[PDB]
Amino acid sequence: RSSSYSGEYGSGGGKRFSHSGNQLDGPITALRVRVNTYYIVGLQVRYGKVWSDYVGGRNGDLEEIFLHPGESVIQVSGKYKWYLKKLVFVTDKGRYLSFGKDSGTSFNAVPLHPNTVLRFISGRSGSLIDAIGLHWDV
Template sequence: MGAATKILDIRVRHGGAIDAVQIMYEVDEKIQWTPQYGGNGGDLTEISLQEGEFLTSISGYYGNFSDLYVVRSLTFGTNVSTYGPYGAEEGTAFSVPVEDGKITGFFGRFGALLDAVGVYLGPN
């Protein structure tokens, strides 16, 4: 996805693992959706961030699922609330708290499921 000015909405497909993630973001005053990163399985949850709300953390679990090493669970923290966990909290825990600034984008690897996820950071 790359870095954005503002993340507006997050769609997560989840079940026993994270099937897919899709982000609505603003960059250069244009609003657009990323492609869906991952497959079409699992339940769909949509997180709509409010005006002034921004991502301050992402955490979750990764591990083996159906003989694949994937992201099992995701939780999103903002300056207002916490969303999740989505998926199964099984495997090895990870956490990316942002002390000063905000999460402005995501990168990762995917196939039918989300294999890996990382974040881009920017100032508040």
């Protein structure tokens, strides 16, 4: 078995969410992160050609980045307090896809098993992103 899970990074507020079902749509191809002055407000991930249902709140500006064909996320770092503040998605093409504010408790998630990549995310949300989890697999 090659699946592994990193998290949760954040606190216990909000309601749990998961993109477990979304991996049937395809590999991660794009990221949407709504950000304000202090926090990561919301998250959306594109699996193959299909965007997940938006999670989080509305009080922030939407940032968006598409992955290149064949580009996979192989490491995720970030920062949090009671809520998520920063995410950096490191890819196998050497890109560091950064969102949010450089402050708070830091974390650094890497996959446990050989040759695995980021397949989906989970976490907790409300008006903000309270917590995030990273799920790795072949």
